[PDB]
Amino acid sequence: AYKVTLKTPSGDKTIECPADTYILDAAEEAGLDLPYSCRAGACSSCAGKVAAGTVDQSDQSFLDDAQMGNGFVLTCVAYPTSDCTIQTHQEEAL
Numbered sequence: 830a831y832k833v834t835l836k837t838p839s840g841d842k843t844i845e846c847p848a849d850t851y852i853l854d855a856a857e858e859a860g861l862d863l864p865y866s867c868r869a870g871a872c873s874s875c876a877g878k879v880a881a882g883t884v885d886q887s888d889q890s891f892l893d894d895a896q897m898g899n900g901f902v903l904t905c906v907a908y909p910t911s912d913c914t915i916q917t918h919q920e921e922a923l
């Protein structure tokens with residue numbers, strides 16, 4: 830699996846996520862407690878910010894082009910495509 834380093838307000842936690850699993854789902858399977866609501870890619874509750882590595886969030890609808898270009902990600906609909914580092918709890922930085 831890809832190693833996903835979640836940089837959270839309570840420290841960095843690196844977890845495993847296969848290519849076919851959403852970031853948010855892997856984090857909750859690993860025991861993290863990340864923000865979410867709709868789980869459909871249509872809000873900002875689950876927003877993270879990619880510091881390194883790549884994700885595929887092609888089904889997302891809520892972020893604009895500039896936000897995605899700055900690394901923002903909806904973790905509920907994002908698959909990893911490499912080992913990656915994602916700051917969590919980023920909704921208020923949008």
Ligand code: FES
Pocket residue numbers: 864865866867868869870871872873874875876891903904905906
């Ligand atoms: S929880 Fe709404 S987009 Fe992820």
